[PDB]
């Protein structure tokens, strides 16, 4: 996260860390959507251009963390994966279209003051909240600049109109993505950056006071560059696929 700040304790209880067993390294962020289901970006697990193709056994999911490196005894819980589900039409060849994946945990995780799931939006919530100008919140342990932070970082960013997102890049953008960030003259800055992938972009509903996950950190070109924006997977647009997987498995 660029231009963010240290998160408060328990501020993002659905935040999950995708950790590689060997070598031990932070692969991506992710989010807890239930006692046994984790949501992340499909490219965190499969990306042929960089020779990335992880299997269940190559990963660990750490939940309830704040410090990036420390093993938080009595606070964080570690789970192993039973199965990974990548969207069948995830487009790694061109623009990371449908960059979404579900991960089923071996055993349900017990909730605590530091571990609690986020809500997935419904058509109504998606419609009323996903509008240009409205701010969401992104969290992660990724790069602080285009090194890494000691604890979870947070940054609030405004959703940008689709035309503006399209005209800022040469990449073909789809209905399954949205972009966020401040424009060059707005005076404020901030962005997600490498290491933040898979993390949640959330918004707090003013109707029922709940936090909903509207996006997944997907991609960008550089970090916090003027006239450039971060791109996120549109969670609601892919909710049908999400439900289908959870119902079948």
């Amino acid at each position: 996260i660029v231009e963010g700040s240290d998160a408060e304790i328990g501020m993002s209880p659905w935040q999950v860390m995708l950790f590689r067993k060997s070598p031990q390294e932070l692969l991506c962020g992710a989010s807890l959507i239930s006692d046994r289901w984790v949501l992340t970006a499909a490219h965190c697990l499969l990306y042929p251009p960089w020779d990335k193709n992880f299997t269940e056994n190559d990963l660990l999911v750490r939940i309830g963390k704040h410090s990036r490196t420390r093993y938080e005894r009595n606070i964080e819980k570690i789970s192993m994966l039973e199965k990974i589900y990548i969207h069948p039409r995830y487009n790694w060849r061109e623009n990371l279209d449908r960059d979404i994946a579900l991960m089923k945990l071996k055993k349900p995780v017990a909730f605590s003051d530091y571990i609690h799931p986020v809500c997935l939006p419904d058509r109504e919530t998606a419609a009323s909240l996903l509008q240009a100008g409205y701010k969401g919140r992104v969290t992660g342990w990724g790069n602080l600049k285009e090194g890494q932070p000691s604890v979870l970082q947070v940054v609030n960013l405004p959703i940008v109109e689709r035309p503006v997102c399209k005209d800022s890049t040469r990449i073909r953008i789809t209905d399954n993505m949205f972009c966020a960030g401040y424009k060059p003259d707005e005076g404020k800055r901030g962005d997600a950056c490498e290491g933040d992938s898979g993390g949640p972009f959330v918004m707090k509903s003013p109707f029922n006071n709940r936090w909903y996950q509207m996006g997944i950190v997907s991609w960008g070109e550089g970090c916090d560059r003027d006239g450039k924006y971060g791109f996120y997977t549109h969670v609601f647009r892919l909710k049908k696929w999400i439900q289908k997987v959870i119902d079948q498995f």
Binding site: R20, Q24, A41, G147, I216
Partner: peptide
């Protein structure tokens, strides 16, 4: 393009797995 760092971590105890 798509979003480890390597700023090394504290070992995870076996009893946590």
């Amino acid at each position: 393009x798509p979003x480890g760092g390597g700023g090394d971590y504290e070992p995870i105890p076996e009893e946590a797995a």
